[PDB]
Amino acid sequence: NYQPTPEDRFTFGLWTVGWQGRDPFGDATRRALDPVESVRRLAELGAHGVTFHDDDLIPFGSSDSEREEHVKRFRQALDDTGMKVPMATTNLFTHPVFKDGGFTANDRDVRRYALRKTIRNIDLAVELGAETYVAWGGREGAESGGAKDVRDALDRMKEAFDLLGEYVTSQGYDIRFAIEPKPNEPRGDILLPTVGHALAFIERLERPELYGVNPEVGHEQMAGLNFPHGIAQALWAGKLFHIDLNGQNGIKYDQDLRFGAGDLRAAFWLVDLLESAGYSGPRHFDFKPPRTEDFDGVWASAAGCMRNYLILKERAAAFRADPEVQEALRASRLDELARPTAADGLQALLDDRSAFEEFDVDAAAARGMAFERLDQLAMDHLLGAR
Amino acid sequence: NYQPTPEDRFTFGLWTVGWQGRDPFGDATRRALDPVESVRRLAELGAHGVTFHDDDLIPFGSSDSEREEHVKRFRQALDDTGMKVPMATTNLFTHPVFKDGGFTANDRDVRRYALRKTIRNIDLAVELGAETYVAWGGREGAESGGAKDVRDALDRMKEAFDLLGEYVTSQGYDIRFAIEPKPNEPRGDILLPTVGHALAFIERLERPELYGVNPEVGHEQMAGLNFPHGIAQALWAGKLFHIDLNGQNGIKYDQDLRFGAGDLRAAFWLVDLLESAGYSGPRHFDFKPPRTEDFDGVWASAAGCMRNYLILKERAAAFRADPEVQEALRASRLDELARPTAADGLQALLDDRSAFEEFDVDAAAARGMAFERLDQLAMDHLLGAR
Amino acid sequence: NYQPTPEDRFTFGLWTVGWQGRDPFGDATRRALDPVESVRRLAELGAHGVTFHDDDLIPFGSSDSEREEHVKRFRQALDDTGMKVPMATTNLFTHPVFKDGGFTANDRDVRRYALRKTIRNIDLAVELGAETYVAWGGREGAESGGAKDVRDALDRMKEAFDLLGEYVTSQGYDIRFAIEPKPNEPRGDILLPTVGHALAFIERLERPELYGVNPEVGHEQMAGLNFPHGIAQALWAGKLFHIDLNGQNGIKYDQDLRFGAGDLRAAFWLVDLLESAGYSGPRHFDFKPPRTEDFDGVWASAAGCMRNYLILKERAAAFRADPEVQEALRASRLDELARPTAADGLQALLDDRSAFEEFDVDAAAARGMAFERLDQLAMDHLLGAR
């Protein structure tokens, strides 16, 4: 019941099911996973593919010879399973040299090193067939106010993404970039903290059409924001290139719970929107099986991500297909929201006495929105109470 | 000591010192202020001018005759005091007809009414000499997921701002718009919830150059965000048209405390940035004297907004003028942050072996940022301990 | 399907379905309800009873004659419907005299007035058969640090509750008190901000056994806290006298959404706990139908509170009755959590070499908790996917 297939386009980072459980107060509770074992185990669970940071796949400092061996082993697992690699990304956050950032480190030589490390992995991502290159600037930011001039940092950030876009276009690569916002952690404040800040920054890049966002459920919720709303704005701008699905219990540290956990109703409205909008990218799970779990709990948690998506997809489809819901949507004037306010144009609106001089403001004010009956229909559908 | 003058460009909304103290659980604790009395009292405190919503100045439903009388009285107070009106805005939030929004109400006739109400007040703002027209979409949003298709709402929002920009340009008005973001309250979630979301939306408008942001200290702090960072991004984009100054104690209801209260260190870094960047707009206080206060407390609170700005301006100037601070900034490589990462260009960076092949990552990793000594210098300056 | 009966003990405040929609930025969108009409409408929806503040029932300033008339009318509606009044409370927050508190106002004469106003309504509550008297100190607190010495305020707060307990015991009344915590709003910070702070304060009162807590879902969530955990601590202490059910979307202003909205999974675990623990008090809904709604939306929202409770009660019962869940609970050692750590006593534990000297810490560390499979069983039950 509710079984995923590779057509559902579910993907997982190596670093997700492979998280050993080391947290700021505790050592690892699980041994490291061979990326080949993860590929095979995820393929049996019905996943469509995997993603990776460079350092998840090739241990940091690997010689060029060890590097090729690690890739060849990985490629063979992809060939044996049919798994794809739709997305890749760079680790610009773990090694101590990145303690003040990569692209916006105050030290110029670290910024150049950061760009060279990224470019090396773009080549590899393209070799493996990735369509999207994600950038999560986890160390770009500050704990104190004088440490970072944010306008200079934004200049440096734009400079880095512009150079990466020059590299991609000069190589003829068919790959696009996706900025993954996060409001804080591990820096006190992280630059481009939300979907909106990333969308606004992109519009200042030399080639804006190469760049979109990879929003994460938990990250926008770490600022108390409505994740489905943020996704709707990304869709409206044409910039939802990729998405990270997981769960988060409000404003606290980045929990990365399995998808469906955390804010369940938000997950429902997210699935409703992705499916209604015809999102056709990967459904990527950026999550961490809790460190209480052994390896069987890891795979149970990963299976749960997929199951919860498929259950919510069924309930959202049932909600939208229900005539009583369709009738309720009309009662709340969702149909009117979709109509132009003034397709008759400015001058017609200015001479339309029914818009102002003869508008009956009290009759309008008295009409109820009927939103609560609509939301209870939505609740009943989610819970399978109809 | 620390006395404001009209050259300091301090401005106040009528609705700020005029807030009667009605909150969701309590009745008014103060009688209504005549806008003429506020103008005269603020001018004696050293303010530079006032702002208004249409309904602050002209009671809702006023005949055209009463309207002219209210304006004429107000104009005479401006002439007697020398006070300016740099900014005006529309009340699209108080009257029950706006309970589901103005520009993005589901009811089309309310949206048209909302546009006509705004256009009427733009004419008045221009008559009074306002340079900036603010839009705070306080009712644009939702409490439940099905109530608002956010993509349709964004279409309607863009349609409204586009029509207003057509109106302004067709009249030849020299006025620009400034969107005031707020993440929530009074709606469960408000559209365009942060500075970043508003900046991104503007880039989809037909005439983006007419529109900027009017960020509010407390609003970005209601999402846990770093307000000086958000202001830096607005400045970097060239979009800080106006700013609302006040105080807020973290993530809760919109307190609108006087400026300097709330997050004091954030206020310091904000003043440092506005003054370093040469912000030359109004320093507008969107605040509410607490309802514990009588009228003398109102004017004490308003004087405090200005005093705290002027004290922080002095401490920030002293901080930046201090040679030991200038030396510390170099020690933390703020000077390197301001230099291009790769002005030698992509190809030079790709063949620069010192950026990767021969980069000594451990030597780089070992260099301390010296951020804590810098921040303690900043703390000592703020507290006048040097 | 899922129909409430008066045996389900669902109750509503007059002020809930009677909220006119006035918020800090907007006027009322609904006319005032006659308390008699609310009683009759709620009884037809299946409610068991109503609660009231004194000022909900008797308009403030009413003569003793008008007072008796208002009570007599109300009593007749209770007799005609069979509705009970299980709980009553005092409005110590709306009138401007309470702007700095009632029990902990800095002005002594306001504190005495506050006590006399409460005592008058205790008499009335007892006349109407109320078992619980709630105290929500909404104005007890401060916006600034010097305004309130909190130790003095706590002395005054204890003095007030002690005098009320003396009054009750001297009259021979069979009524107990329940403190309703709230972390903030309308004060910047409210005293006794959470369930824990109220539980701790009670233990310093002269007659602790007269006092318990009335926790509210949304209030503990306004501090980011786990409401089921807080309820479990109240139960463990024997102090859950009453409970307020509603919904809240994280850390922001007090939304008072209908129960089931907000954090749906938290609502599920709350119902599971109340029913497992055999809570037998009223299921009270302290909620506000959103101001978008007309009167039909009001009653739809109130019906939804009850429906969602009954749906969650069914899913929690199914979860706990499921053998596979019972097996999973054993796999995660919930049975071991319920056993004493050291019923053999201190000396036995100190000489038990298997507890330390020969404890195999790595074998213990390797056992997975199996929490994720358990939580997915809980998710599947909630969603009716088994």
Place this chain on the structure above:
Amino acid sequence: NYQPTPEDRFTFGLWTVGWQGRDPFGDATRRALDPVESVRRLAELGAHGVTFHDDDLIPFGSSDSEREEHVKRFRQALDDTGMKVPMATTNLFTHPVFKDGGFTANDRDVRRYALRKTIRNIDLAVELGAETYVAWGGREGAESGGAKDVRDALDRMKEAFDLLGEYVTSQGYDIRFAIEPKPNEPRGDILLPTVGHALAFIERLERPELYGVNPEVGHEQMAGLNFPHGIAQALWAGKLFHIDLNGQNGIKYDQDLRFGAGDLRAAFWLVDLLESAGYSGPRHFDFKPPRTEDFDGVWASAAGCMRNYLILKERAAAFRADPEVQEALRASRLDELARPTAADGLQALLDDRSAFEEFDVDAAAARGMAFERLDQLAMDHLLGAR
């Protein structure tokens, strides 16, 4: 200027200045510190003493022989410097065996192991002269609702603290316990999440007088709570045995910034209260020098903790000594807050017509609190603008 002396009672955990910089996304940026070097370096900065977890001082798994050697080395550093050890604590959070808790682990054998590990370190703490034994239940809690029955966990938690109190009293030790609350991180929710919940729990222990709280600035701020208020309640209950000082920027992950950073005004009101109340315990800094820092930044950060305390102590003393402030406090009726509401007793209050029948509610309502002028005096003192 502002130099600490050992009479200022400033103390530091070994784990604070010794934090290597490993965070959930990054490796260590600093080498490990020898506890002897920390003792000597802190003594030269003017600290009064150090605290430790067992595993900070004796590496986990150390033979009894290595153990004695580690203690002897440490003792010699204390003797050479004059440093005290006022407080000690147990690491029940790092090792994987504690992944589901120590005292409230679901596995009974882990709970017994947890108690034996604690008891071993109590003996050592007493040997070294510690007055307070802290308990921070960082792993006691859950990420999902079914994983932990909170009433059973509270039974287990009480059982553990009761056994520890039996051990202490049976040995005749002069040591008291202090529970350190934290709302979340590393568990999704932690048991006894705030000062209030810990104070309430203590009152159910067999020997409540052995137990108090060790509140941490940042932890209560992680729930959005007012830390000075929480400290005032702890003082009022007589339970502030110890305190952890640091900085935190609102509701997010546990930053542990140096004291004075984060909420500066809250730090001021905290110092004002500790000094006014005559707190005479250690001023303990539970902080982490940011991982951007090298070892010189570590010691600069630690010096800053102490400096900021001493600057704030001076400004708070100046504030309270200022006649104009003393006059303002009377104007705001702080003197009336400190007087009994009804020392004349219940019957006198019931027959006092000036408390109700003849109370002039409108005259009372019209009196302003004058809180804003008071708070601006407090602001001017903090900033040294008088």
